[PDB]
Design an enzyme around this catalytic site. Structure first.
Site, PDB file in Angstrom:
ATOM      1  N   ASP A 210      21.313  63.175  32.539  1.00  0.00           N
ATOM      2  CA  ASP A 210      22.658  63.218  33.087  1.00  0.00           C
ATOM      3  C   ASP A 210      23.102  61.847  33.579  1.00  0.00           C
ATOM      4  OD1 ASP A 210      23.904  65.954  32.965  1.00  0.00           O
ATOM      5  OD2 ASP A 210      22.279  66.548  34.294  1.00  0.00           O
TER       6      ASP A 210
ATOM      7  N   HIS B 113      26.202  67.013  38.094  1.00  0.00           N
ATOM      8  CA  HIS B 113      24.954  67.638  37.699  1.00  0.00           C
ATOM      9  C   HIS B 113      23.768  66.847  38.228  1.00  0.00           C
ATOM     10  CE1 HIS B 113      27.215  69.423  33.989  1.00  0.00           C
ATOM     11  NE2 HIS B 113      27.623  69.936  35.133  1.00  0.00           N
TER      12      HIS B 113
ATOM     13  N   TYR C  63      20.558  67.977  41.286  1.00  0.00           N
ATOM     14  CA  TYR C  63      19.108  67.949  41.281  1.00  0.00           C
ATOM     15  C   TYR C  63      18.515  67.260  42.503  1.00  0.00           C
ATOM     16  CZ  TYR C  63      19.819  68.971  36.261  1.00  0.00           C
ATOM     17  OH  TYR C  63      20.240  69.522  35.049  1.00  0.00           O
TER      18      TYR C  63
ATOM     19  N   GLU D  35      23.288  66.855  24.814  1.00  0.00           N
ATOM     20  CA  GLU D  35      23.840  67.889  25.678  1.00  0.00           C
ATOM     21  C   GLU D  35      23.504  69.325  25.243  1.00  0.00           C
ATOM     22  OE1 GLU D  35      27.971  66.158  26.638  1.00  0.00           O
ATOM     23  OE2 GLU D  35      27.210  66.925  28.623  1.00  0.00           O
TER      24      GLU D  35
ATOM     25  N   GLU E  78      27.417  72.215  30.217  1.00  0.00           N
ATOM     26  CA  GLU E  78      26.847  71.500  29.045  1.00  0.00           C
ATOM     27  C   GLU E  78      27.203  72.205  27.752  1.00  0.00           C
ATOM     28  OE1 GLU E  78      25.508  68.396  29.148  1.00  0.00           O
ATOM     29  OE2 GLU E  78      26.508  68.838  31.066  1.00  0.00           O
TER      30      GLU E  78
HETATM   31 FE   LIG Z   1      24.327  67.827  32.267  1.00  0.00          FE
END
Ligand SMILES: [Fe+2]
Length: 287
Positions: free
Chosen positions: A62, A96, A100, A161, A195
């Protein structure tokens, strides 16, 4: 010279995709993850480490897609409406990537987080796969680019992706599908919802430019696409072996990788490469 005029369509779909991208807007603060600590602590050391590793690899991809992929692809587009959607998609890749970190901050200690990122940084397979994709983007760092250079960057973006993420997405889905780490699974599903439409959209753009290439360029590009698919697949098989043998899931993930390669191919308007195969049912449940 030209300003985006959204009162005159430049094509038949950027508007739909624009609306869908913004209607799917989300940020990490909408999903609290603290309740995943309860199941996290019941994971074995091998399972915890696999989860952390795959999230790390996800964060890298990402990081590339948002900071190289979308900017270098969109910069050259003459379609200003399509360019707009891709800009928004880039921003979302960053949301995104940040998600995380939000997962990591509840699960792991400071020092543990450092370790994850040191690992992702020094990783030869992650380096190799990210560099392959990213070299197509970086080809576009010049004042003008050809359709074929632009087409291959788009191939590479759909492979990232629609395909390369999925060796990573397998595991949070697989845990969530068992009621484990379900809040983090929720975030991963929001990422997947995004995605999924990203792969479709850049594939539509690819198919437009493909129709504008000469017969000779069409076949250079198709030969390149197949080599690229398989160069990436080899690295994914190595990756999957490294990450998942410790927890006995290698061949399950490989099926999932192949399935998602096929979808990537489909998004590009191309035929599947791997035998149709039933996906692991607990990851279907996690979806
Ligand atoms: Fe992504």
């Amino acid at each position: 010279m030209r300003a985006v005029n959204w009162n005159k369509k430049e094509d038949d779909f950027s508007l739909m995709f624009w609306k869908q991208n913004i209607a799917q807007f989300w940020t990490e603060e909408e999903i609290a993850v603290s309740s995943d600590k309860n199941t996290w602590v019941q994971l074995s050391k091998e399972e915890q480490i696999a989860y952390k590793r795959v999230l790390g690899g996800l964060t890298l991809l990402d990081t590339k897609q948002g900071g190289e992929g979308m900017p270098l692809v969109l910069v050259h587009l003459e379609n200003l409406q399509a360019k707009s959607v891709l800009a928004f998609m880039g921003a979302m890749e960053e949301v995104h990537a940040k998600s995380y970190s939000h997962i990591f901050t509840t699960l792991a200690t400071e020092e543990e987080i450092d370790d994850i990122f040191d690992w992702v940084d020094n990783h030869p397979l992650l380096e190799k796969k990210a560099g392959i994709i990213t070299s197509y983007y970086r080809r576009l760092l010049k004042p003008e680019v050809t359709k074929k250079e632009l087409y291959m960057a788009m191939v590479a973006s759909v492979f990232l992706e629609s395909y390369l993420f999925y060796s990573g997405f397998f595991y949070p889905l697989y845990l969530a599908g068992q009621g484990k780490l379900t809040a983090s699974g929720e975030i991963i599903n929001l990422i997947i919802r995004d995605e999924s439409i990203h792969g479709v959209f850049v594939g539509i753009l690819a198919q437009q430019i493909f129709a504008e290439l000469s017969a000779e360029e069409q076949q250079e590009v198709q030969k390149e696409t197949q080599e690229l698919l398989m160069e990436l697949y080899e690295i994914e098989m190595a990756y999957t072996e490294e990450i998942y043998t410790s927890i006995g899931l290698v061949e399950d993930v490989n099926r999932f990788v192949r399935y998602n390669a096929n979808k990537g191919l489909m998004n590009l308007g191309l035929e599947p490469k791997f035998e149709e195969e039933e996906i692991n049912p607990i990851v279907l449940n996690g979806l």
